[PDB]
Design a binder for these strands. Structure first.
Ligand SMILES: [Zn+2]
Ligand SMILES: [Zn+2]
Ligand SMILES: [Zn+2]
Length: 279
DNA sequence: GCGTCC
DNA sequence: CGACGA
DNA sequence: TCGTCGGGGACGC
C-alpha cells in the first residue's frame, strides 16, 4: 500500500499537523518539529508530546507514515569547524525530538561546501555528522534527501548519496528520500515513463531501493538540469503529470511516506486524491 | 541591495 | 515557515 | 487575519 500526503503546517502545535493531514484525507504527512529558519526552540513539553501522539493515534498515522524534516540552517558538511559543530549539535537535537515524539524517520539535506573544502571532504563530514547523531540516539533513521544542486549544495548526484551512505557505520539507520523536482533540476529526466525508468534504474544502480525511505512528490517550476530548486503543483510544472502516475503505479514506492511539497496547499486534498486514483 | 523561495 | 505581537 | 523576525543559503532581479 502507498502512504500519500503533504508537508502540513504545525502552526499552533505539532498535533495540528496530524489534524490538518486528516482533513485533507492524507495517509502520510511531513512536518517541522520546530521552526526551520531559527536555531533555537523551547524543549518539547510533555503536553505537546502527548497531544501529538494522541492525534496520530486518533487519525491512524503510525511512525512509518510520518516524515519530519530538519531545519534549513543545519549544514552537516560545513567546512568551518565551529559552524559544523553547531549544526551537528542542532541535528542531534532534532533526532532527539523525534525520539521523544515516537517518530522513526528524520529527513534532512546533505550539506554544502561553500567552495572552502572539496566535495570528497564535505561528503565525509556529512557521513561523520550522521554517525555522531546515530551514536547519541536510538530508533531514528537518518533519511538523506537528494538536492537540486543549488550553489555549493551537495546531494544532487545519486553518487553523493551513495558516498555518504558508504561512510555511515550503522546502515540500518540511514536511508534516502527522493524529491522529484530536485532530481529533475539536477539533470535526471522524468518527463516520460521511459525517462522515469532510466532515472530510477540509475538510482537502483547507484544507491539501491533498499535505502529508499520516502519521496517528495513535487513538479518543477525550474527547468531540466537547471540546478534550481523551485517547486510546482502536480502537472503544472516542467515535469508534467506522467511521472507521478508512473510512480503511483510502481510497487517499489509502497510502505514509505510519499509527500507533496507542492506550492498551492489549497489543492493538496485534490492532489492527494488524484495520486490515489492513479494506482 | 531587494523580495522571494527552499 | 511558526511564534508572536496588539 | 495581518506584518514581522529569524538569519542559512540561494535565485533572479
Ligand atoms: Zn528538504
Ligand atoms: Zn524536498
Ligand atoms: Zn525543494
Amino acid at each position: 500500500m502507498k502512504y500519500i500526503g503533504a508537508h502540513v503546517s504545525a502552526a499552533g502545535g505539532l498535533a495540528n499537523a496530524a489534524i490538518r493531514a486528516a482533513e485533507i484525507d492524507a495517509t502520510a504527512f511531513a512536518l517541522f518539529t520546530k521552526n526551520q529558519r531559527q536555531w533555537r526552540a523551547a524543549p518539547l513539553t510533555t503536553q505537546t508530546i502527548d497531544e501529538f501522539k494522541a492525534a496520530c493515534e486518533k487519525y491512524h498515522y503510525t511512525s512509518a507514515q510520518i516524515l519530519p524534516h530538519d531545519s534549513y540552517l543545519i549544514n552537516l558538511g560545513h567546512p568551518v569547524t565551529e559552524a559544523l559543530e553547531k549544526s551537528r549539535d542542532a541535528f542531534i537535537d532534532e533526532m532527539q525530538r523525534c525520539e521523544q515524539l515516537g517518530l522513526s524517520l528524520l529527513n534532512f539535506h546533505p550539506g554544502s561546501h561553500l567552495m572552502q573544502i572539496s566535495e570528497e571532504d564535505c561528503l565525509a563530514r556529512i557521513a561523520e555528522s550522521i554517525n555522531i547523531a546515530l551514536d547519541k540516539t536510538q530508533g531514528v533513521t537518518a533519511v538523506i534527501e537528494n538536492t537540486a544542486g543549488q550553489g555549493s549544495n551537495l546531494g544532487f548526484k545519486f553518487e553523493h548519496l551513495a558516498a555518504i551512505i558508504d561512510g555511515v557505520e550503522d546502515k540500518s539507520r540511514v536511508g534516502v528520500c527522493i524529491d522529484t523536482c530536485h532530481a529533475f533540476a539536477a539533470g535526471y529526466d522524468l518527463r516520460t515513463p521511459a525517462e522515469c525508468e532510466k532515472t530510477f534504474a540509475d538510482f537502483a544502480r547507484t544507491v539501491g531501493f533498499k535505502y529508499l525511505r520516502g519521496m517528495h512528490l513535487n513538479d518543477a517550476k525550474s527547468t531540466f538540469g537547471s540546478r534550481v530548486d523551485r517547486h510546482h503543483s502536480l502537472g503544472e510544472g516542467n515535469i508534467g503529470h506522467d511521472a507521478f502516475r508512473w510512480i503511483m503505479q510502481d510497487d517499489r514506492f509502497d510502505g514509505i511516506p510519499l509527500i507533496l511539497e507542492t506550492i498551492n496547499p489549497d489543492i493538496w486534498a485534490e492532489e492527494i486524491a488524484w495520486l490515489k486514483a492513479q494506482q
